[PDB]
Amino acid sequence: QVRTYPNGLIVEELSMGKPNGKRADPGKTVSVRYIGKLQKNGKIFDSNIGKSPFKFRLGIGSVIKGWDVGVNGMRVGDKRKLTIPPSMGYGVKGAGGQIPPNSWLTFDVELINVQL
Amino acid sequence: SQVRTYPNGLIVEELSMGKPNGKRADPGKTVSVRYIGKLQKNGKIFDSNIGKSPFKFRLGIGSVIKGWDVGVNGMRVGDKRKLTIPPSMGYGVKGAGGQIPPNSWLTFDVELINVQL
Numbered sequence: 001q002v003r004t005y006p007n008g009l010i011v012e013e014l015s016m017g018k019p020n021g022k023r024a025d026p027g028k029t030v031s032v033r034y035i036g037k038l039q040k041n042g043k044i045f046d047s048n049i050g051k052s053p054f055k056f057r058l059g060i061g062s063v064i065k066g067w068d069v070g071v072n073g074m075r076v077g078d079k080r081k082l083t084i085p086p087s088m089g090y091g092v093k094g095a096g097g098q099i100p101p102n103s104w105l106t107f108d109v110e111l112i113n114v115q116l
Numbered sequence: 117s118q119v120r121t122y123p124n125g126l127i128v129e130e131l132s133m134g135k136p137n138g139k140r141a142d143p144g145k146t147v148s149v150r151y152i153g154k155l156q157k158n159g160k161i162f163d164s165n166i167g168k169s170p171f172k173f174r175l176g177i178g179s180v181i182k183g184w185d186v187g188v189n190g191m192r193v194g195d196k197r198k199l200t201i202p203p204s205m206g207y208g209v210k211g212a213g214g215q216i217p218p219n220s221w222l223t224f225d226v227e228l229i230n231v232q233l
């Protein structure tokens with residue numbers, strides 16, 4: 001299904017993982033596969049398909065706010081689409097070469113593991 | 117004259133001379149730069165903001181890798197430098213994902229666009 005937030009964040013469950021999938025909660029280290037796109041033109045700026053999974057501690061601001069919120073509650077094998085407003089990404093200013101000012105971002109994220 | 121080395125292995129080379137009285141990147145000032153970043157061992161460019169909005173940071177507070185805090189210091193607007201940055205002054209043993217492996221030397225070309233205060 002779909003959840004929207006008043007700030008414009010959209011979190012869509014694309015597919016469910018197996019029933020026994022470990023759950024991602026704040027403070028857990030998680031491993032994910034992702035494809036990241038600029039929402040304005042569908043240009044893919046990064047993916048780790050065919051690469052080592054991306055590991056981070058959920059809920060500590062290591063990653064953009066849209067990920068901390070959007071990955072929370074995933075179970076192993078779940079895939080979500082996150083449609084992230086600038087305020088939950090890199091803001092008005094944008095970021096480096098990769099992210100223009102005022103960028104809406106779309107990520108497809110698959111939860112690979114959770115360290116309980 | 118136009119190359120300086122540091123005991124940690126950093127090399128700072130002046131590529132281009134900007135404005136003679138151009139505002140100077142001094143510690144504690146917010147500075148705006150254009151850059152190209154390359155993995156030295158295979159010459160793979162991992163990022164650049166050339167032709168895009170400049171990158172702003174506060175110099176000398178550890179918000180960026182050590183090689184930048186040291187290497188950008190003293191630039192004047194319009195200057196360009198090449199930084200040859202050892203792992204200890206970059207991403208060290210951990211690296212930065214697959215694009216920047218453990219124990220990687222980095223090279224950056226950096227151009228100073230502006231200094232605020």
Ligand SMILES: CO[C@H]1C[C@@H]2CC[C@@H](C)[C@@](O)(O2)C(=O)C(=O)N2CCCC[C@H]2C(=O)O[C@H]([C@H](C)C[C@@H]2CC[C@@H](O)[C@H](OC)C2)CC(=O)[C@H](C)/C=C(\C)[C@@H](O)[C@@H](OC)C(=O)[C@H](C)C[C@H](C)/C=C/C=C/C=C/1C
Pocket residue numbers: 036045046054056061062063064065067098099207210211212213214215216
């Ligand atoms: C080469 O590839 C990059 C990732 C690239 C950069 C460019 C962007 C387009 C992108 O392609 O990822 C991208 O797809 C993206 O936007 N990502 C990556 C996947 C998670 C979501 C998002 C993100 O938040 O990235 C992150 C985004 C760019 C920066 C953060 C945004 C939120 C903000 O609160 C944070 O403040 C801290 C900074 C990058 C990361 O996920 C990496 C892992 C983490 C950090 C750098 C910070 O958390 C830092 O905080 C001190 C740390 O704790 C780290 C471990 C310290 C060590 C030395 C540095 C490691 C650096 C690794 C860098 C990696 C693999």
Ligand SMILES: CO[C@H]1C[C@@H]2CC[C@@H](C)[C@@](O)(O2)C(=O)C(=O)N2CCCC[C@H]2C(=O)O[C@H]([C@H](C)C[C@@H]2CC[C@@H](O)[C@H](OC)C2)CC(=O)[C@H](C)/C=C(\C)[C@@H](O)[C@@H](OC)C(=O)[C@H](C)C[C@H](C)/C=C/C=C/C=C/1C
Pocket residue numbers: 095096097098099151153162163164171173178179180181182184212216
């Ligand atoms: C999307 O693009 C990324 C930049 C990418 C990430 C991946 C690397 C390959 C790279 O492509 O840049 C790259 O070319 C690179 O290596 N850079 C960027 C240009 C400066 C030199 C170097 C660097 O130090 O990056 C930095 C490197 C990855 C991490 C730092 C390395 C030194 C270490 O001491 C720091 O510990 C603290 C962490 C990223 C940055 O320059 C950004 C600005 C700074 C931070 C995230 C931290 O300082 C953080 O700590 C709380 C902050 O104080 C910030 C301001 C808080 C706000 C909310 C977050 C802003 C996030 C911006 C993210 C940006 C533009």
